[PDB]
Design a protein around this ligand. Structure first.
Ligand SMILES: Cc1cc2nc3c(=O)[nH]c(=O)nc-3n(C[C@H](O)[C@H](O)[C@H](O)COP(=O)(O)OP(=O)(O)OC[C@H]3O[C@@H](n4cnc5c(N)ncnc54)[C@H](O)[C@@H]3O)c2cc1C
Length: 295
C-alpha cells in the first residue's frame, strides 16, 4: 500500500518547477529554498516521511553523469495546495570551503535546485523510504527532533495533522494526540516555516508544542551555544515520560551528529527508573517507533 519506486533513475519522471521560494529570512545564514514541482502527466504518488531523488544535469569531475541525490519530501501526500498534483522539497545550498578545494565549494545538486527557475524540467525518482512513516493512529504521540532541513519530514506530519485543508481532505485522520517539535537552527531568520509552525501551536496549544534551539541567540546552562541536544537534555525527563507510552513515536532528521547527545540525555533520564536507554531504544526501533534519517 505504501508507494515506492514508481520512478527509477533509468527512466525518471520529468516534472516542472512551479515555484522556488526562500525560507531563510534577512539576517539568516545560508540559503534554504522551498521548491514545488508539478506531478501532472505522471503517476508519482507518495506519503508523509518519504524522500524523492533529483538527478542534476552535467557530468562530475571524472566526466561521469551525475547521480541522484535524495531529498526528504516536505509536502503531505496531497501537496501544498491539497490538490494531489504537486510535491515540495526543502533544499539547503551546500557550501563549505577548504580541505576539499580552493575556497568556497558549492554542492552540485543543491545549488542546481536552489537556483532553479519556475518552468524548468527536473528529473525526479521515487518515492523512497519506509523508516520515517507516520502512524495511522490519530491518538499517537509524535516527538520530532529536527535540525535545519530535517524539518522537512516534520512539515509533512504537522501539515497533515493540523492544516485546515488537510483535516477536511483526510476524514480518517483527525489528530488528537500530542506532538512536540524541538527544532535547532542558528538564527531566528533560519527558523524554516516559522510563521506556520507558530500558527499551528497557537491554534492547537494542547496538541502541539514548539521548542527552539537557536545557537547564535541562546546559550545552554554551561555557556555554550544552544543546540537541539541541549534542549533535549533540558526536557529529558518529560521526553522520557512520553516515550514510555506504547503509542509514542520519535522522529529524528537532519545532518548527522545530533543523536549522540540526544541518547546521553535520554539515557540519564531512563536510568533514574532503572532502565538502560540503549536497550529500550533497540526495542523501540524493532517496534517501528524510533525513526531516524540523518545525512
Ligand atoms: C534520506 C536523505 C534525505 C535528505 N534530505 C535532504 C533535505 O530535505 N534537504 C537538503 O537540503 N538535503 C537533504 N539531504 C542531503 C542531500 O541529499 C544532498 O547530500 C545535499 O543536498 C548535498 O548534495 P549536493 O549535490 O549539493 O553536494 P555534492 O556536490 O555531492 O557535495 C557533497 C560532497 O562534498 C563533500 N562535503 C559536504 N559537506 C562538506 C564539508 N562541510 N566539508 C568538507 N566536505 C564536505 C562530501 O564529499 C560530500 O559527499 C538528504 C540526504 C538523504 C540521504
Amino acid at each position: 500500500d505504501v508507494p515506492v519506486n514508481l520512478y527509477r533513475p533509468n527512466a525518471p519522471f520529468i516534472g516542472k518547477v512551479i515555484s522556488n521560494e526562500p525560507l531563510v529570512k534577512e539576517g539568516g545564514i545560508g540559503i534554504v529554498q522551498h521548491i514545488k514541482f508539478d506531478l501532472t502527466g505522471g503517476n508519482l504518488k507518495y506519503i508523509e516521511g518519504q524522500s524523492i531523488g533529483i538527478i542534476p544535469p552535467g557530468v562530475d569531475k571524472n566526466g561521469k553523469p551525475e547521480k541522484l541525490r535524495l531529498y526528504s519530501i516536505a509536502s503531505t501526500r496531497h501537496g501544498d495546495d491539497v490538490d494531489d498534483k504537486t510535491i515540495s522539497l526543502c533544499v539547503r545550498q551546500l557550501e563549505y570551503k577548504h580541505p576539499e578545494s580552493g575556497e568556497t565549494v558549492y554542492g552540485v545538486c543543491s545549488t542546481y535546485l536552489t537556483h532553479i527557475e519556475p518552468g524548468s524540467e527536473v528529473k525526479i525518482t521515487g518515492p523512497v523510504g519506509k523508516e520515517m512513516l507516520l502512524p495511522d493512529d490519530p491518538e499517537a504521540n509524535v516527538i520530532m527532533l529536527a535540525t535545519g532541513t530535517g524539518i522537512a519530514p516534520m512539515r509533512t506530519y504537522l501539515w497533515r495533522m493540523f492544516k485546515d485543508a488537510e483535516r477536511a481532505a483526510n476524514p480518517e485522520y483527525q489528530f488528537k494526540g500530542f506532538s512536540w517539535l524541538v527544532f535547532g537552527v542558528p538564527t531566528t531568520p533560519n527558523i524554516l516555516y516559522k510563521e506556520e509552525l507558530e500558527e499551528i501551536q497557537q491554534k492547537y496549544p494542547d496538541n502541539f508544542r514548539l521548542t527552539y534551539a537557536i545557537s547564535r541567540e541562546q546559550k545552554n546552562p554551561q555557556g555554550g551555544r544552544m543546540y537541539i541536544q541541549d534542549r533535549v537534555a533540558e526536557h529529558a525527563d518529560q521526553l522520557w515520560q512520553l516515550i514510555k507510552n506504547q503509542k509514542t513515536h520519535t522522529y529524528i532528521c537532519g545532518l548527522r551528529g545530533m543523536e549522540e547527545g540526544i541518547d546521553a540525555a535520554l539515557s540519564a533520564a531512563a536510568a533514574k527508573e532503572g532502565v538502560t536507554w540503549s536497550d529500550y531504544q533497540k526495542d523501540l526501533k524493532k517496534a517501528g517507533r524510533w525513526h531516524v534519517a540523518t545525512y
